[PDB]
Amino acid sequence: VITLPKLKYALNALSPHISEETLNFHYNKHHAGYVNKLNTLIKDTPFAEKSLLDIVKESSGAIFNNAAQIWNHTFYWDSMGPDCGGEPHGEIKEKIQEDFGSFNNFKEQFSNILCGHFGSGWGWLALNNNNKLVILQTHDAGNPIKDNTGIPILTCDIWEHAYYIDYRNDRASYVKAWWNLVNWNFANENLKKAMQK
Amino acid sequence: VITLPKLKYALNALSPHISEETLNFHYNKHHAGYVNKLNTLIKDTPFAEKSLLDIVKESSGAIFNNAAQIWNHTFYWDSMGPDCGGEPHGEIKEKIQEDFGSFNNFKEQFSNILCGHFGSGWGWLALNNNNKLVILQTHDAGNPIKDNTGIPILTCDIWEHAYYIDYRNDRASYVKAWWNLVNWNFANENLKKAMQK
Ligand SMILES: [Fe+3]
Ligand SMILES: [Fe+3]
């Protein structure tokens, strides 16, 4: 029953910023891996009929690890696109200006958070409870939904598997390149959703 | 200032099990990077003149993260060598037999926890305080000394950088290959010292 959601673009679509190779390993291997392990762990428990998010919300241990990673990855693929990147636009542009001063303030702060996360984890743009954009970081499979720290708008995966093929130990160049990939229309979809609450 | 202790072998001495390319990034980028970064963090601080192990035992935060990783990597490199691997011999052969039934019991339990570790971390063979060999796992920069959980005898790095170049997402092949590299002498020397107390 839990299926690996489809990419909205081709395996080559993020090149040269993230490679076709990477997306093959990250999506066809790692991401699919979390779906298959989750389906195994929940087959005959209370979790089998519950939704991905409910699982994420109520689970712990190995089930949460795989559940959250599935959700995190889907959010990550949708956080990017071909023909995306550069300056923001629409509502998210106006809110990033309001809540961080300027786009440039946000980008640098986000990049620094992304680059200094120790070990495996994620960076997030999130809407907190003051109806305010906020930069978070989570470790491993952690998630702002689980933490109740904010409603996700964008995410960027900082596990070594997300860049190691293309960038080796050079996380900073992966981060730089990711800005060419950021999908502002997903961000806008999420901000409108998130404001409704 | 703390230094990057030389390898006991050549860059390509662990191939084909761990390639020369991996060792180059793992040792010359990752491991050195931890050295340069710790030197800068302790520069003008109470720790500027303490030994690696004292910093490991006494600190937290980014300082702990870098010190612990220099230590954990040197132990990792010393845990391996060319013309090693295979069955254990001497004191470690015997104590493993006693504490786990047989070598194959240990190798399978140790492969399982090495493969099972979620996110970044380390597998350990250690002497616990009941004078018993046990398998420990630590997350991120953690080691058993800091944790007072045991005396390390052998370690194996599970961060994706340790294997991603050679094995991609296939952690289990890296662990299978690692068995061809296990330095039982280093193990023996550690058990002797450890058993002395
Ligand atoms: Fe990932
Ligand atoms: Fe490492």
Numbering used by the authors:
A (entry chain B), B (entry chain A): 1 to 197
Question: Which sentences did the original study use to describe this structure?
Answer:
The crystal structure of PfFeSOD has been solved and refined against data extending to 2.5 Å spacing. The refined model consists of two polypeptide chains, A and B, which are related by a non-crystallographic two-fold axis of symmetry, together with two iron ions and 140 solvent water molecules. The overall structure is similar to those of previously solved iron superoxide dismutases, consisting of an amino terminal α-helical domain linked to a carboxy terminal α/β domain. Since the calculated molecular weight of the monomer is 23,799 Da, this indicates that PfFeSOD is a dimer, consistent with previously characterised FeSODs, which are either dimers or tetramers. The metal ion in both subunits of the enzyme is five-coordinate. The coordination geometry is trigonal bipyramidal, with His73, His161 and Asp157 providing the equatorial ligands and with His26 and the hydroxide or water oxygen atom forming the axial ligands. Trp122 forms a hydrogen bond to Gln69, which in turn forms a hydrogen bond with the hydroxyl group of Tyr34. Tyr34 is also hydrogen bonded via a water molecule to His30, which is bonded to Tyr134 from the other subunit. This classical hydrogen-bonding network in superoxide dismutases may allow communication between the two metal sites. There is an interesting pair of adjacent charge-charge interactions between the carboxylates of the Asp140 residues and the side chain imidazoles of His139.
